[PDB]
Amino acid sequence: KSLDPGLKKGYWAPEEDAKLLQAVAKYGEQDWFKIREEVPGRSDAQCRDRYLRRLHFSLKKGRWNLKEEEQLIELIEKYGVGHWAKIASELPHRSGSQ
């Protein structure tokens, strides 16, 4: 993921919306090593988290309404603090990064 002349450190999505989203239907959620051979400028390490955080569906998003605080409470009430504790390993997709 570094010192590579073929990688691109860009920020926007030039051609990515196709080059990376084709893997959605082309290949499953495993063996990312196969896709990196066709998409230039993109590495597997960043590709995994990009694919994950861009196409996910079930996430607590929207405006902070009068009913979201109970959601947060029952979230931190599942197993513990969650954000960094080891319980983060079983919280489904609620990693500390977010």
Next chain:
DNA sequence: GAAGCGAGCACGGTGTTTCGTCCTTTCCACAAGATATATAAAGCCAAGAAATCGAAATACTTTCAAGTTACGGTAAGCATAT
């Protein structure tokens, strides 16, 4: 005619070869060696087949090199809010 000058032939030598034993064999022969055979107990020598153990080959364990999935935490420049 017999005394002074040139005269055969028996004889006496080595050296070389021949002849004829004595040599040790090859070969042969009369008398007597195991040579067959009967034990039989003993322990050891010694040339064949069957069971056993050492070496190791190909095989599978196991352990040690590579490495890429999956995973958890911080930092910058564009967008957007009062």
